[PDB]
Amino acid sequence: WTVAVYCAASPTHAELLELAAEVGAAIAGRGWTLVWGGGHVSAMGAVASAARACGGWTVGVIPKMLVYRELADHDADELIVTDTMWERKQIMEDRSDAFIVLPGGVGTLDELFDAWTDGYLGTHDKPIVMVDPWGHFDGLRAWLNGLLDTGYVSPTAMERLVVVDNVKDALRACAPS
C-alpha cells in the first residue's frame, strides 16, 4: 500500500516540518510505502527523512531540472528521475493508492488540482486527503465554496476532497479497505 505526499518545497516553519515528519513517521508505522516529490528541502525533506527513520520505504519522483539544482534527496530508497514535470506527476499517481496534501505553495496546488480533477471526473477512486491543522488552506476553501454557490464547482467535486485537521484522521481516510 503506497501513499503519495504532496507538500511544501521552500519554508522551514517548525510547525510545518513537524506535521510533515509526523505524516512520514505514521505512513512508515503502518508499513506503507511513501511516494513524494523526491526533494530534501522543507516539508518534502521532513516527510521522507521521518519515514526512513521509522524503517519506511521511500520513493522520490523528481524532474532532472531539480536534480541539477541539488534539490534531490539522494537517500531515497528509490529515486525516479524524469525529464519532465508531466512524467513526474503521472508516475507519482500511477505508483500510489492514496494522496495526502499538506500545506504548500504553487507546486503543491498543481499536484492537488491534478489529482482532484482526475478523481472528480471518475478516472480513479483513490482517496485525496488534505491535512490542515492550523487553517493554511482556509482562504482557498472559502473561495472554492463561493464557486460552489455561483455554479463553477459541483457539490460532487467538493465531496471528492477529504479535509482533516490531524494525522490520525488522515491515515484512516487513506487506509486500505
> Could you list the residues that contact Mg ion (CB under 5 A)?
90, 93, 114, 117-118
The answer to whether 100 and 3 are in contact (CB under 8 A) is: yes
Using an 8 Å Cβ cutoff, are 100 and 6 in contact? yes
34 binds a second copy (CB under 8 A): no
Query: Minimum distance between the CB of residue 165 and a second copy, rounded to whole angstroms?
Result: 17
Q: How many CB atoms lie within 10 A of CB 167?
A: 19
Local structure of residue 72 (DSSP, 8 states): B
Neighbours of 45 (CB within 10 A): 22
Please report how the helices 14-29 and 42-53 are oriented relative to each other, as an axis angle in degrees rounded to 10: 30
* Site pattern 116..145 for a second copy (x: CB under 8 A): xxx-xxxx-x----------x--xx-xx--
**Site for a second copy contains 32 (CB under 8 A):** no
Least separation in angstroms between residue 142's CB and a second copy is 7
Smallest separation (angstroms) from Mg ion to the CB of 19: 25
Q: Which does 164 bind (CB under 5 to 8 A by kind): Mg ion, a second copy, none?
A: none
Q: Which of 3, 4, 17, 61 binds a second copy (CB under 8 A)?
A: 17
* DSSP symbols for 18-68: HHHHHHHHHHHHTTPEEEE--B-SHHHHHHHHHHHHTT--EEEEEEHHHHH
The full DSSP string for 135-158 is -TTHHHHHHHHHHHHTTSS-HHHH
Residue (4 or 50) nearer to a second copy, CB? 50
Looking at the Cβ atoms of 99 and 137, the one nearer to Mg ion is 99
- Contact residues toward a second copy (CB under 8 A) are 8, 10-14, 17-18, 21, 29, 31, 45-46, 49-50, 52-53, 63-70, 72, 74, 79, 81, 84-86, 89-90, 103-107, 109-110, 112-114, 116-118, 120-123, 125, 136, 139-140, 142-143, 146-147, 150-154, 157, 172, 176-177
